[PDB]
Symmetry: C3
Subunit: 318 residues, 3 copies
C-alpha cells in the first residue's frame, strides 16, 4: 500500500540505513523499479515538480552529488548547490544550528554531505525540513546501501523473502576496516537470510561491532549459524559459493577473469566506485560485472527516495 507507506515517510529525514524499515524498503525498491523502467523507455519522469532543494556538499564527492542533482532534475524539481567548500569556509564563524535553522526556511529539503558526523546530527536537529544524508565521517551513507541492496535484489529477488531455504551468500573483499559501505550494507543484508564471506588481510578485518550487529540481526530472524560468517585470507576460498562479490575501495585482492573462473555461474560483481586497480579492466567485458549498472541504479533509487519523502500529492506505474 504505497499510499500508507508514503504517509509514514512523508517528511522523514534519512541519515542512517536503520532509519529505513521493511515496508519503507519495499516501497523504495518498488518505486526505484518504476523509475528504472520509465527512464529506460524514455517516458515522462516528472513525478515530483515544484520542489526546491538545497544540496550542500562540504567535501569533494562529485559522483554522489551529480547523482542526487540528476535525480532532482529528472523528477522535474529544482536545486541550489553549495559545493567545493570544506566544513569551516561554509560556517565562516556561524553555528551549524543557525546555518540550518535559516537555510531550512528557503527550501523544501536538504541533501547534506559532510565528513563531520557531528554536523549532520546538528543539522537534523536544527532544520525545519527533511535532510537526506549523502555521506558523513562515521560511514553513514544510506542511499549507497539502498542502491547496493537494490542491485542485489534485481539479480537475487529471493533476498526479500526471509525463506529458510533461500539463502544469499555474499563475499566482501578488500579493506573491511575502513570500507564503511560494507558496514552499512552488511547491517541491511543481515535483516534477511544471508551469509557472509569476509575476505581481508589481517589489519583490514571487519570490525567487531559490525560482526555483532550482523549476528544480532541474523539471530533475530532465526538465520544465524556457525556457517553464517566466515573469514578468509585469499580469493580462491572466499569466492567459493557466493552469489555476490562486493569489492571495496582502497595487491593480493585484485579481481581478474582468472580469479573468477571458480565462482558460480550466476555470481554478480559489485563495487561502490571508483575502482583504482582492485578490478582489472578485462572484467568489464565479463557479464558477471554489474558495478556500472550499480552506479546507474543510484539515480533510480535516489529519485525513488525523494519522491516518497517529499511528494505532497498519481504514483509511478508502468
Amino acid at each position: 500500500d504505497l499510499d500508507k507507506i508514503m504517509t509514514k515517510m512523508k517528511n522523514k529525514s534519512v541519515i542512517n540505513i536503520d532509519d529505513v524499515d521493511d515496508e519503507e524498503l519495499l516501497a523504495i525498491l518498488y518505486t526505484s523499479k518504476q523509475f528504472e523502467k520509465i527512464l529506460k523507455n524514455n517516458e515522462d519522469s516528472k513525478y515530483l515538480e515544484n520542489k526546491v532543494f538545497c544540496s550542500v556538499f562540504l567535501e569533494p564527492s562529485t559522483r554522489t552529488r551529480c547523482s542526487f542533482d540528476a535525480a532532482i532534475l529528472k523528477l522535474g524539481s529544482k536545486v541550489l548547490n553549495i559545493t567545493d567548500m570544506n566544513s569551516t569556509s561554509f560556517y565562516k564563524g556561524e553555528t551549524v544550528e543557525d546555518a540550518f535553522k535559516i537555510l531550512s526556511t528557503y527550501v523544501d529539503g536538504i541533501i547534506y554531505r559532510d565528513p563531520s558526523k557531528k554536523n549532520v546530527d546538528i543539522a537534523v536537529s536544527s532544520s525545519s525540513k527533511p535532510i537526506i544524508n549523502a555521506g558523513n565521517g562515521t560511514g553513514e551513507h544510506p542511499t549507497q546501501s539502498l542502491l547496493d541492496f537494490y542491485t542485489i535484489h534485481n539479480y537475487f529477488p529471493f533476498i526479500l523473502d526471509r525463506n529458510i531455504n533461500k539463502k544469499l551468500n555474499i563475499a566482501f573483499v578488500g579493506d573491511l576496516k575502513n570500507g564503511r559501505t560494507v558496514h552499512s550494507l552488511s547491517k541491511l543484508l543481515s535483516r534477511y537470510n544471508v551469509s557472509f564471506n569476509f575476505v581481508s588481510c589481517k589489519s583490514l578485518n571487519i570490525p567487531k561491532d559490525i560482526v555483532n550487529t550482523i549476528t544480532y540481526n541474523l539471530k533475530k530472524n532465526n538465520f544465524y549459524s556457525d556457517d553464517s560468517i566466515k573469514y578468509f585470507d585469499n580469493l580462491e576460498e572466499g569466492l567459493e559459493d557466493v552469489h555476490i562479490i562486493y569489492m571495496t575501495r582502497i595487491n593480493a585482492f585484485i579481481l581478474s577473469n582468472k580469479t573468477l573462473e571458480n565462482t558460480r555461474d550466476d555470481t554478480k560483481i559489485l563495487h561502490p566506485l571508483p575502482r583504482v586497480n582492485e578490478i582489472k579492466v578485462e572484467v568489464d567485458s565479463n557479464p558477471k560485472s554489474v558495478y556500472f549498472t550499480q552506479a546507474e541504479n543510484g539515480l533510480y533509487v535516489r529519485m525513488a527516495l525523494l519522491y516518497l519523502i517529499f511528494s505532497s500529492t498519481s504514483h509511478p506505474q508502468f
Copy 2:
C-alpha cells in the same frame, strides 16, 4: 489592499535596484503587499510560480552564501531559472576584461542579473553597460537594498502603523553595536527616516553612527514634520538605550551582548532583529524569548526577494494574474 499594482508595475518594469533610494513610497507599498502574498502562498503550500520562463544570472564576486542562496531560492520558487557565477573574487572573473564589456555581453544571454561585488565602482559600471536590469545583492559602500527591504518588511509585520505617517504613532528603534561599519544600519535608517521614527544609537565611542547618516535621517524626518530634539538619541549602554523601543536591531561585529536579563526592562511588544550571522552578540537563550524575530527576519528575505523579482521582471501582467490570497 490600498493600491494599483498594475500601474506601479508599469513604472517598476525593468527597473534596476542598486540603492534603497531607488525605491519610492508606492514601490515600497507594492513590494510590501506582494511580499505578504508570497508569504501566505508559501506557508499554505500553494503554487508559487508567478514568474516562469525567465532566465537569470547570479554573479557573486565575494563569499556571501546566505544572500546568494536566498535569491536563487526566490528565482526557483517563482519558477524561473538561474545560472551562477560563484566563489570567484573580482579579478579572477574579469581575467583582464573590462567590466563594461563583461556586462554588455552577459546581459544579451539573460533577462536580469543579480550582482554582488565589494567594489562599489563595478556595480555602477554594470548598471551602465548592462542592457538588462540589475539587482544589487550588496557592495562595498554598504548599498544592500533587499536587506533594508526585508528589514522594513519585518518591522511592518509587527508595527504596521509605521506606514501611516501619523503624528501620534511613532516607532522607536534602537540600533546597537558597531554603528560605524554596520552599513545595514545606515541603509535601514535612511528608509525608516521616511516615516514617523525615533532613533536610539547604542554604541561605544569609536563605533558611532556616521555624521552624514545622522544628517540624512534629520533631513528625511524634517521633510515630513517628524523631527524633534528627541528624534535621535545616543547611548553608552543597553539599559538606557533599550528603554522604550518597539524594535531592537543588533549588528554584526563585549558590552552590548543581548541576554534575557537585559531584555526584562524592554516593552512587552518589542521585537528583536539581527541581519545575521550572530557570533556572540545575542545569547542563544534569547532564541526562546518570543521577542526574538531574527530567524523570521532571515526567512522574510525569500518573500521580499520573490516580490522584488516579480514586480521588476513580469512581462505578462494583467490585474488578475497577480498573487492574491
Copy 3:
C-alpha cells in the same frame, strides 16, 4: 527556407560534435536556419522552449566563464536543465579515476554532456566511453566547434553569398594578430575554406599562421575550384592587409591595434569580429563604429548553441514542432 529539417535532424540525432569537421554542408545549413529562428524568437520575446525535459551535465575543467554561461543559458532558454561541474582543473575531478570510468558512469545520469578540458586526449576518451552525446566546448588542440559555428553564422548574416559557392561572389577575410596561437582562426579558416573565400593573414613574423592550416585551406579551396595564387596573402601591416576585405577578424593577444583611423580605408561594408575578450586590440572608440559586430557575434553564440542542442537532442521529428 531551402531544406528538409526533419531529415537532417534524423541524421544529427545523438551526434557528438568535437571538431568543425564533424559538421557537414547540410548540417551547417540546418544549424544556420535554426540559429536564425532562435534569434527572431528571442528578440521578439516569444516562447523559446523548443527542448524541455532534457537534463544536461556541463563539465568545465578550466575557467571559461563566457562559453560556459552561454551554453547554460542556451540549455535553460530551451527549457531544459543543467548540472554544473565547474572551477575544477583536470586532476581534482578524476581524483584518481580513469576518464573512461568517469564518463561511462556520468553518461548514465544525463541526456548529454558539455565538456571543456585543456587536454585534447580527455575529450576523445570521453567520446569513446560516453553512452551519450558530447559537445566539445573547447580543448587544448584548439578544437572549439560552436565558436566557429557562431563566427560563420555572424559572417553569413552580413554576407549570405558565402553559402553559394559562386565563382563570381568571393568573400575576402583578414585575420589579424597572433595567428600561431589563435586557434579560433585555425578552426574558422578550415570552415571558411569549404566556400569561395580569400584570406589575408596579417601578422608579425613569429606569430604567423601555421603551415598545416595553410595546407588545409589550400586543399579545401582546390577541391571546389577556388584556389588561385591570390587566395592566400600574407601581410606585415594593417593598411595593406585591410584593403579589400569584407570581414576583419581580430585575435586575442602593438602594431595591430584597431582604430577608427586604421578603418578609414576599408570597404564600407566591412564587418569587424573578435572572439573576445579584447584587451585593447580594439580601441573602445570602434564600438561606436557601425562596422563593429563583435558584441553581436558574442550574442549570436546563444542562438547557435540553442540551435545545435535542439537539432542534436530533440527526440524526435516533428514537422509541426520546429522553430519558425
